[PDB]
Nucleic acid binder design. Structure first.
Ligand SMILES: [Mg+2]
Length: 580
DNA sequence: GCCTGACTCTT
DNA sequence: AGAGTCAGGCT
């Protein structure tokens, strides 16, 4: 049952064909500066396993890796590329990435190893990585014969599966999406991760000192007001103090017991002085543990940088996610929190952070796809979209829009951009399900084109089995036909939301590719550091700011041509915080 | 150790 | 929705 291969102790020319499946195995979850445990090559001449100390010290092998005209098929090529970048080796000529191919074919499969991709085409001659490496504490690299066979089987699966994946992509009109968008983006992301983002650890540490002291003050005040010490961070213990000792009313239960969420506690504040102090404690503790301690833990002491990993094959919308650290949820809303962004600084002296963000990209996409005359007109006039929505829903003039009217309109706009239920909108606005339904109804009378689009997109999802984005990304929605109402409704909302959010993701990904090309053409030293859904963050010499002010917004604005303009705001400063 | 549930940040 | 932290109950 053992697949034939050559366990090479030296590199030979027949290993360096100009078309090959390549496995460069990094087993550590976080691949930054991580070991490469083994290498496998499959090509028309046979199957080969190479030890990394052998292969990666071979000038011919390394040149082969770096020759763009020697084509390679891989799985998760960014992992390999980055691990190699840390060893000073460049990987080029990756013409097919099976991870990204499987992701585009069906993002809900959750394909995370070669075995899971292979299964989609009834190929099972490869083991899941979890079966070979083990799980958790038991995770280990096996002995060489077991390792070697695994890597060769992965490589053989890649070799076999390229053709059928490419054929289905083509049938779906997704072949360009793979080859011209996701794969090129993967190289750009690899560069971004490798560059990293410099952190002023001293400033974070001082902030942590300050928080630590404010926490101790509040924590003591909590115990005074409770008349005893307890674990504030245990919703169980807190529940007993609040709802039993202090007899506060129970406005919401959870599966386990009593809810202690911020929104419940906010309704309880008038009853007892402990509640505000709990909320304050939760806010500070969140900052301290998730953003000060959580960032400090993942700063590389060697670089003084954080090197995130972007997961390009996770979301069902096509958005990127970010880990270790997650840089897509750094506080912005509250000033105390926002100050965390002061710790993200340029990696060189006399460089600055430059940030550019799309203004209402999701609603502008909606205008374009729905062709709603009112929404299209609003963006053609570059109106404040929330004020304009308030004017229409409440049928008032601009100077009759009150702050609460605007807040409520904005909540409706948010519910559209994120596909939330009427229940969700109700929770968000602290109103009844019924009143939420009336708001939504008023919206559709002002934007009948959006209503029509919603109805049409759901019918299309029902007919075809899936919805698509501008750039041909697909999401299958088998629950759209369910008889469970909550199940069906969620799927209908995903039918509505996905073309919106997915198309925005498509646009920014194209912008990133276009921007990388232009930065090179223009000979700038500016580099992309991060993407945060609708914004791009770069660092550059201070001497490049004026050029980037013109360059970056134009590249982002012209990424696609919609029925409405795209608009990009930008800022720069000495820290990410100041780039506001 | 491993797993789940509660909670919270941004988008 | 996605990532992360903490507790608490599992083995
Ligand atoms: Mg924005």
């Amino acid at each position: 049952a053992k697949m034939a291969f050559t366990l090479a102790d030296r590199v030979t020319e027949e290993m360096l064909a100009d078309k090959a499946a390549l496995v460069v195995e990094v087993v550590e979850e976080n691949y930054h500066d991580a070991p490469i445990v083994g290498i496998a090559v499959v090509n028309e001449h046979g199957r080969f396993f190479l030890r990394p100390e052998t292969a990666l010290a071979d000038p011919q092998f390394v040149a082969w890796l770096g020759d763009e005209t020697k084509k390679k098929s891989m799985f998760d090529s960014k992992r390999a590329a980055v691990a190699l970048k840390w060893k000073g080796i460049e990987l080029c000529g990756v013409s097919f990435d099976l991870l990204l191919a499987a992701y585009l074919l069906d993002p809900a499969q959750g394909v995370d190893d070669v075995a899971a991709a292979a299964k989609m085409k009834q190929y099972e001659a490869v083991r899941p990585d979890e079966a070979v490496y083990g799980k958790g504490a038991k995770r280990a690299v096996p002995d060489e014969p077991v390792l070697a066979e695994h890597l060769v089987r992965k490589a053989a699966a890649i070799w076999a599966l390229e053709r059928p994946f490419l054929d289905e992509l083509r049938r779906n009109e997704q072949d360009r999406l793979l080859v011209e968008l996701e794969q090129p983006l993967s190289s750009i992301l690899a560069e971004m991760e490798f560059a990293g983002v410099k952190v002023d650890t001293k400033r974070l540490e001082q902030m942590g000192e300050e928080l630590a002291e404010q926490l101790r003050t509040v924590e003591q005040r909590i115990y005074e007001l409770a008349g005893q010490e307890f674990n504030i961070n245990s919703p169980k213990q807190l529940g007993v103090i609040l709802f039993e000792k202090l007899q506060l009313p129970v406005l919401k239960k959870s599966k386990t017991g009593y809810s202690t969420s911020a929104d419940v506690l906010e309704k309880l504040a008038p009853y007892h002085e402990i509640v505000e102090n709990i909320l304050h404690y939760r806010q500070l503790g969140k900052l301290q543990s998730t953003y000060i301690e959580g960032l400090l833990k993942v700063v590389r002491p060697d670089t003084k940088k954080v090197h995130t990993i972007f997961n390009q094959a996770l979301t069902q919308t096509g958005r990127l996610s970010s880990t270790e650290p997650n840089l897509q949820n750094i506080p912005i809303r509250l000033e105390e929190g926002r100050k965390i962004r002061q710790a993200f600084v340029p990696s060189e002296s006399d460089w600055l952070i430059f940030a550019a963000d799309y203004s209402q990209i999701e609603l502008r996409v909606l205008a374009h796809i729905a062709e709603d005359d009112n929404l299209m007109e609003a963006f053609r006039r570059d109106l404040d979209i929330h004020t304009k929505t308030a004017m229409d829903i409440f049928q008032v003039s601009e100077d009759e829009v009150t702050p609460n009217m605007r807040r409520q309109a904005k909540a409706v706009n948010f519910g559209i951009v994120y596909g939330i239920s009427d229940y969700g909108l109700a929770q968000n606005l602290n109103i009844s399900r019924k009143e939420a339904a009336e708001f939504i109804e008023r919206y559709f009378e002002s934007f009948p084109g959006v209503k029509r689009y919603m109805e049409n997109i759901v019918q299309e999802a029902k007919q075809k089995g899936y919805v698509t984005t501008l750039l041909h990304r697909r999401r299958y929605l088998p629950d759209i036909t369910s008889r469970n109402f909550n199940v069906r409704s969620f799927a209908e909302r995903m039918a509505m939301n996905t073309p919106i959010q997915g198309s925005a993701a498509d646009i920014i990904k194209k912008a990133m590719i276009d921007l990388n090309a232009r930065l090179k053409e223009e000979r700038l030293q500016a580099r992309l550091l991060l993407q945060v859904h609708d914004e791009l963050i770069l660092e550059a010499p201070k001497e490049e700011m004026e050029r980037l002010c013109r360059l970056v917004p134009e590249v982002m604005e012209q990424a696609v041509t919609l029925r409405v303009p795209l608009k990009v705001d930008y800022h720069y400063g000495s820290t990410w915080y100041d780039a506001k």
